[PDB]
Amino acid sequence: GLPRLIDAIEEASKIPAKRRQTPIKPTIEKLTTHLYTHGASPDSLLRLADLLTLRNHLDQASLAAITRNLYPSSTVSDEVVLRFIGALGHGQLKPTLALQALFLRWLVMVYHLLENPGVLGQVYGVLFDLLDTAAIRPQLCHLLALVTRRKHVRPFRIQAILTLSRQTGGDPNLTGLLRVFKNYYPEIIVASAFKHPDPQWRQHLDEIQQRRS
């Protein structure tokens, strides 16, 4: 069922709502209801990540609703992860900062379902260089705290985040990430604890994941 729903949304997303022959709203609600009930398979997650990150004519409310119901029924592939990472930052190809925040939050919430979580370590710089962008900083810090390994904690990165903390006047999410850096190099001098951003989402994701056994 799901592939036909995505088919319809993807074709409607190429057309301004003014010019569509039928409104897309009922198919959005069918998709989001199906996502909530069954989650999405790895192939469907790629298709969904495409309409979430490409520039198209879907409205922001529908895009947020899909993201909030983007429950993986199985695992999350490297291609999906890299689609969301490629959508981060400033650019004519890129989605709103508000959506980027939800993508980053989602990445934290499905971290244990990534097929190769180490792939985030290979794009560490993309994530780290965006810490200036205050609109996504809390979600960046949380994701970076999960991804940071010793090899990422290079002196230039230690200083940039010390400089950013000073210049912003202190920021508890930057302080949290600095404490992760501190775990590796305790000579760094340094209040956010990065708990799960949505325990309800976790419980419902777990219920969907329960069916795999």
Side-chain angles (χ1 to χ4, degrees), residues 95-200:
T96 61
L97 292 170
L99 276 169
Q100 298 180 213
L102 297 180
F103 299 160
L104 255 356
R105 180 175 157 263
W106 182 83
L107 252 4
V108 163
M109 297 196 297
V110 300
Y111 187 84
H112 58 297
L113 307 169
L114 303 186
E115 280 160 26
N116 169 213
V119 78
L120 287 167
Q122 304 175 264
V123 292
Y124 193 89
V126 179
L127 289 166
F128 192 80
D129 294 342
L130 287 175
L131 285 170
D132 39 19
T133 308
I136 59 183
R137 177 179 306 146
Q139 286 78 31
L140 281 174
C141 290
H142 196 336
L143 181 63
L144 250 7
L146 259 31
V147 170
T148 291
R149 306 293 97 99
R150 176 176 295 279
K151 77 195 179 166
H152 302 121
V153 189
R154 302 272 54 243
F156 75 99
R157 292 211 184 105
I158 304 170
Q159 188 60 235
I161 190 169
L162 296 170
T163 297
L164 191 64
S165 184
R166 176 185 61 80
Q167 287 191 280
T168 55
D171 178 302
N173 298 297
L174 296 171
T175 294
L177 178 61
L178 262 164
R179 281 179 188 159
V180 173
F181 284 20
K182 172 78 163 306
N183 294 337
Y184 294 94
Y185 293 99
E187 42 272 42
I188 302 167
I189 317 107
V190 301
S192 194
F194 295 128
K195 42 174 224 152
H196 194 284
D198 194 345
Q200 312 77 297

